[PDB]
Amino acid sequence: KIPGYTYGETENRAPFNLEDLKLLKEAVMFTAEDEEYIQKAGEVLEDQVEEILDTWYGFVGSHPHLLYYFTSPDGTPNEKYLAAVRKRFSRWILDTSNRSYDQAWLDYQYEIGLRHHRTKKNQTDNVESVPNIGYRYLVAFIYPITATMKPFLARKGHTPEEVEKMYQAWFKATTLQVALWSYPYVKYGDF
């Protein structure tokens, strides 16, 4: 029901598999305990998803060199572009929470990588905009994406310890995903 959202119906197999994923879970110190807590993160954020997106887009719109990546060629924000991506972004909050990180998940990670990269940016929504998001910012955004989240994890009044556990699980999953999304950016053989 979400236009452009193709989880489980992607054209490509990811170039990484569940063996790659396990080693790389290990590199970010992600275990079964984080599965439980990322899932608990979802139940807690699910309600608040609108406010979260406003927090996030309000940080994005605040910074012209960041808003830039949603702009029409004339410099003005493409509002169709913003609204469509927003729906798919909101769904990723829940996917990160609720999906098995199996091969269909990996296939979508690869896809999300391709859509930030020049390979597939601007094709999902059929818009004219900047061709590529500099990978430097994909990495940088790990910070605000985790930050932005933490206050929201506190709002159903969970213990600070449980909030800390959901925040760490989230920090790890975001780091894990951004690391996968670098594939189409990274010189072949260097990934």
Contact residues for its own copies (CB under 8 A)? 20, 23-24, 26-29, 63, 65-66, 117-118, 132, 134-137, 139-144, 146-147, 168, 171-172, 175-176, 178-180, 182, 185-187, 189-191
| Closer CB to ligand HEM, 3 or 160, in the complex | 3
Q: Is 53 in the site for ligand HEM (CB under 6 A)?
A: no
Name all contacts of 132-140 with Cβ < 8 Å and 24+ positions apart: 133/69, 135/182, 135/185, 137/66, 137/69, 138/178, 138/181, 138/182, 138/185, 139/178, 139/182
CB closer to ligand XE out of 14 and 173: 173
* Shortest distance in whole angstroms from residue 145 CB to ligand XE: 5
Sign of CA dihedral 29, 33, 39, 40: negative
Give the x-and-dash track for 108-147 against ligand XE (CB under 6 A). Answer: -------------------------------------x--
Query: Contact, 173 vs 34, CB < 8 A?
Result: yes
Contact status, residue 52 vs residue 152, Cβ threshold 8 Å: yes
Contact 18, 161 (CB under 8 A): no
- Annotated binding residues for heme b, as ranges? 81, 88-89, 108, 115-116, 122
- For its own copies, the closer of residues 78 and 109 by Cβ is 109
What one-character DSSP code corresponds to residue 69?
G
Sorted by sequence, the CB contacts under 8 Å of residue 170 that are 6+ apart come out as 38, 41, 96, 146, 149, 153
Q: Which of 48, 148, 168, 182 binds ligand XE (CB under 6 A)?
A: 148
Residues that bind ligand HEM (CB under 6 A): 4-5, 60, 66, 69-70, 85, 88-89, 92, 112, 115-116, 121-122, 124-125, 133, 137-138, 141-142, 145, 174, 178
